[PDB]
């Protein structure tokens, strides 16, 4: 029902399994334990990736007007590399 995502600095993020499958990368490991350990994604990045999961799933349709997803400039370079690593 839930999976645990662990950042390189040791933070554990527990998110709904359906939400984690937003990531093509996580989809491969979880469909192919219920933990995933990201040795190269730090917590300030991983936390924002998890907010993205909530936002993609809530706003998959346009029934509700889709708000913007705010991203601090300081994280955008790593967030982009993380997003590319996770395929989401």
């Amino acid at each position: 029902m839930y999976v645990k995502l662990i950042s390189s600095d040791g933070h554990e993020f527990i998110v709904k399994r359906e939400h984690a499958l937003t990531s093509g990368t996580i989809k491969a490991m979880l469909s192919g334990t219920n933990e995933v350990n990201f040795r190269e994604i730090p917590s300030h990045v991983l936390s924002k990736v998890c907010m993205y999961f909530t936002y993609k799933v809530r706003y998959t349709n346009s029934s509700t007007e889709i708000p913007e997803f705010p991203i601090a400039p300081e994280i955008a370079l790593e967030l982009l590399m993380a997003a590319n690593f996770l395929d989401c």
Partner: peptide, 14 residues
């Protein structure tokens, strides 16, 4: 509550 790690400094071009 333990803080999340801190983001690096923004590169100059940005």
């Amino acid at each position: 509550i333990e803080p999340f790690s801190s983001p690096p400094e923004l590169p100059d071009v940005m």
